[PDB]
Design a binder for these strands. Structure first.
Length: 64
DNA sequence: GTAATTAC
DNA sequence: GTAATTAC
């Protein structure tokens, strides 16, 4: 699994792959939802080249 | 503006 | 309804 580093609203974030819920491709970017504790869902996206192999396996296994 | 999808 | 993400 590992982790994913991204930027969201002027803030640089890092998130555990195990906390990622939904993954999808939009053009050439990979967008996703993740669990940020409590009942809250977060959002994020990275460039294809920056996506860990584990995030890419979740995508292909999902693609929804 | 557009893409896919979401949180709020 | 809208703003948020990368790359044209």
């Amino acid at each position: 699994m590992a982790t994913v580093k991204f930027k969201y609203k002027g803030e640089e974030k890092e998130v555990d792959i195990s906390k990622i819920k939904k993954v999808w491709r939009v053009g050439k970017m990979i967008s996703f939802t993740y669990d940020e504790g409590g009942g809250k869902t977060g959002r994020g996206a990275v460039s294809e080249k920056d996506a860990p192999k584990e995030l890419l396996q979740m995508l292909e296994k999902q693609k929804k």
